[PDB]
Design a protein around this ligand. Structure first.
Ligand SMILES: O=C(Nc1ncc(Br)s1)NS(=O)(=O)c1cc(Br)c(Cl)s1
Ligand SMILES: O=C(Nc1ncc(Br)s1)NS(=O)(=O)c1cc(Br)c(Cl)s1
Ligand SMILES: O=C(Nc1ncc(Br)s1)NS(=O)(=O)c1cc(Br)c(Cl)s1
Ligand SMILES: O=C(Nc1ncc(Br)s1)NS(=O)(=O)c1cc(Br)c(Cl)s1
Lengths: 317, 317, 317, 319
């Protein structure tokens, strides 16, 4: 039986006997994703080039305006805005959303895969909304996921029921469910990190990657892949297994990716998919943020591969 | 003044006072790319999943049929067919086309970028058309390029007049000229290869990569990127500069990429953009093929980066 | 603030504190309508014509399948099925849907406007669902409307809250609310009927039409428009005012249009839009059907015009 | 074997050993029509309604056609329903063709989403003077090519040349015009008449009697069906596909009719004749009228020949 994203969320919402606010939020978000996808695939570019005589800015506005007008949110955190956005009172709902509206867009001149990442928290207190309502550990996530604008557009949605993958059919503007209850392989064969930074690697990372290239036993060395666009590298890791690393070094003691709207939603998808996600010293989802734009190192993927990393990591501790 | 692909090709054809066959071939090829792109982005996937109750094969069929019916071709070589296809006498024209109808499609389950690669030769001999007509060196290419199905779908077309880039506007199904007479950077800051084969690397490749991670002049190390899809990796190399390497390993002692419809067309685009493409021992375009599916090692990209590799290569004889 | 059809229905439905069955129904129906529009604008026709080497039947299948899999219906009546379809028990909901999946389709060979018409009733008894559950007067409509596949695609939805018009943005596959709580003009300037049956007209129709062409008060005569596709002629009456007639003649004492899935939903849209809808002797919504395909004569549109028709009809006892 | 418009025109051009200017022209026109269709189906309308927090359609259509023709290097004079004067292409972009067009006909009723269309006619420049408005004053007989786009339930391009009439379906999934009807011919006689009967008070007596004959046939045969969309391209295209007769005739208040000869009547008459139909003003063939003003009007009755003849017989009966 065919299933769409909207149909699916509605059916889960009725099972749970909820009020509907989250379904309205997710429906708005889904619509924002279709418009972003359309602009990313360069719909209307002929008009820009004079046939009749901003991509991350538009991305941010699409998500921002669709979430605000959903009547389901009260605080919004974005890669693009220095401060949390507080929804005006008439539109205030009960959810906090952190998002990266177009991750990887810094290299979009080469038409690399890009994506939107989002995380949804229930607002916990009844105080007047403020930036502080976004400083929750990822463990508190109600829902998280990403859309990948790759060879095709896919929406990956993680909730407590698990991880589900939806393909955008552009002929009809619908997300079709194509992977139910996805789980990552226990062990993979691919490692993903920018090896041009080798001069600066923490000694444990240097030893870990060296073992993937030169296994002590007779196993085959791992393949390397690194798109440089997080959503694409994480989705490959999810679909094929393995390990993704953007680790900490002495130049970056807290890593580079932002915890709220990059590391946590990926850590959440990974954990709902049976994988792992650590900073080296703790699970990414247990980190308690103090700044909405603070960074975190992240190592995520297949459990055996992440467990092996932590073993090399503790060897150097 | 705005320009489309078909408009651009027609204007060159009349300047060149030619018969139109290459225009018809190129026009047909362009139609195939729009169908492939439509298919790669999953238009109509909802019907396959039962809303009303293989991708590399289809791409090959679209290209074959559009070329055959162009009346402009006589021999077709495809990554997907063990033998050259001989066009029937009534449809025979004067051109030989080597193409990969969907390169990278082996990893499309993760929505990696994919692309179509093509090279167009004039038939050289006067014998009956046969497989022998495709065994020409890349130096003999009349036209070459690729369609990249990435965040957007872009067509890169290379001829003697230089390199030109056309963006597919999917709202109207037209290729829009967006980059005229492209030239690659003299020196880039990114190197690209699968470093998991390090156990098998040639000493010259090993030394070259170390100089990228640990520069002798203590200048900044290069960034690493490796998508694993040749069209995406080479296109990034063209847009941002740098160097792409797929050298030989123990599983691939003659390298892995195919000379006729992968290495030569990319080498031609690179050279027409002012860049370089070498096997280590000779220019890719100077290799005389003996087998239509034969492999080649290739190092290509910015001239300063490619020369430095060759300087290291000669150090190791 | 921007609104889509699904967001609009969710917000009304939450206001009404309902179970969600109707929203699931309306969303499924929206998905079917987007699919039909894609087929109607001939997406993919290149494949039927051999690029790689039914319409009303497909339309009926799309509606049937989205309705069956919506978990909101139990009885379906279609222009295309002699008998009502009884939803299988595990998919049963409480709603009865009567629809014409592609009316006007016999003349789609000239690319005339076509459309989907639908009316939604709540089920009657709790015994076996059966064909009798569709034999309700139009007065019982819970919701009704149509999609028009014209120069653009528009969905018109009528409920207790009023009539609203949604434009399908084909770039993103969303219905955007563009006309809130719409009302028909009190009096229009266009009459619409097939004047080729004039030899068979009821004397009242003859006198009414003569009054439009040769106005007694020397006002300007009405313009005539008749596309031959009911959804197209009816939408024009809604948008611009005027009167649409498919009257009973000497040959067809109960007219030609079908009461359940053509006349009733248009009368319902007309009444909720401030217009009128008569058979000549009674309000269309007051007719109690006895057979699911029974026909009814219909005169609908701007009230002053329909009253003017009724006044001539009453004169002819 | 599949055929697209761009492929088909290239092939015909190579058979005829032409220079390519007409093919560059038609390809440019073809692109404009895909752009109009996209806007007519309302792509991107969510942005106009604030999904992230420009012009009117007949203005945008005219700019699309104007700009593509100018950049085609194939034109020298452009006449449009929307511009009082002929546009004379700048010397650097000048070609040898004169194009008359209605960029978005029927647009007065596009608010109800009725079918609309683009109409075009292409003449060769005859004289050797510098290009001017006068180079467009040619009879329809001089047409090199003519046709229309119908933006209906699907988008179709009907293109007529000496080789005949061909119909192309736009596949919006890939943006190509697919050949779906080769060498089209109209029925000898139809069953549909098409005109605005709301003007009946003012009909010329020939129109009144002829229409009266369609509703109440003398040989107690079945009456004709009526259709009138009110959009010329939709009504004319239906006449081609199903046969029949289309009338926008002259009355005493409009002795030269309302539709424009250069960019509405002539291109439709040219298609009708190439498909085996007829097109008359009542007194002469539309294609034989010599225009004196680029925006002058003409009466037109066109369609299946047997039906047009019956009209002309009724017309002559009323002298
Ligand atoms: O959406 C609802 N209820 C509904 N009532 C009617 C319709 Br129709 S949907 N509840 S919810 O808390 O938002 C939710 C969404 C998901 Br997915 C969950 Cl799991 S729980
Ligand atoms: O295309 C033509 N001639 C034409 N005449 C009129 C039109 Br319109 S096209 N010749 S060609 O040999 O195919 C060619 C394409 C390119 Br690009 C070249 Cl350089 S040479
Ligand atoms: O839709 C709901 N409930 C919902 N709860 C949460 C979400 Br989210 S939708 N009920 S209904 O009876 O279907 C209905 C549709 C319309 Br439109 C009405 Cl007015 S009432
Ligand atoms: O276009 C050409 N020749 C060509 N040369 C190369 C290519 Br490729 S096409 N001739 S033309 O005069 O424009 C013309 C179009 C039609 Br349709 C005619 Cl009949 S004649």
């Amino acid at each position: 039986d065919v299933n769409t994203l909207t149909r699916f969320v509605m059916e889960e919402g009725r099972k749970a006997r909820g009020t509907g606010e989250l379904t309205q939020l997710l429906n708005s978000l889904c619509t924002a994703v279709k418009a972003i996808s359309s602009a990313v695939r360069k719909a209307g570019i002929a008009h820009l080039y004079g046939i009749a005589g901003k991509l991350d800015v538009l991305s941010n506005d699409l998500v921002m305006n669709m979430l605000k007008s959903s009547f389901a949110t009260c605080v919004l955190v974005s890669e693009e805005d220095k401060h949390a956005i507080i929804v005006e009172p008439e539109k205030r709902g009960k959810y906090v959303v952190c998002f990266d509206p177009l991750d990887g867009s810094s290299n979009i001149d080469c038409l690399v895969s890009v994506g939107t990442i989002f995380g949804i928290y229930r607002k916990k207190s009844t105080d007047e909304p403020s930036e502080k309502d976004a400083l929750q550990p990822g463990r508190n996530l109600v829902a998280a996921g990403y859309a990948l604008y790759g060879s095709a557009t896919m929406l990956v949605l993680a909730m407590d029921c698990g991880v589900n993958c939806f393909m955008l059919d552009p002929a009809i503007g619908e997300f079709i469910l194509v992977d139910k209850d996805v789980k990552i392989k226990k062990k993979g064969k691919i490692y993903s990190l920018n090896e041009g930074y080798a001069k600066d690697f923490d000694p444990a990372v240097t030893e870990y990657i060296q073992r993937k290239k030169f296994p002590p036993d007779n196993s085959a060395p791992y393949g390397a892949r690194y798109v440089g666009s997080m959503v694409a590298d994480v989705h490959r890791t999810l679909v094929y297994g393995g390990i993704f690393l953007y680790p900490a070094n002495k130049k970056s003691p807290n890593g580079k990716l932002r915890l709220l709207y990059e590391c946590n939603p990926m850590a959440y998808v990974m954990e709902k998919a049976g994988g792992m996600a650590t900073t080296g010293k703790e699970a990414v989802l247990d980190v308690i943020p103090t700044d909405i734009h603070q960074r975190a190192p992240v190592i995520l993927g297949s459990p055996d591969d992440v467990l092996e990393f932590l073993k090399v990591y503790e060897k150097h501790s």
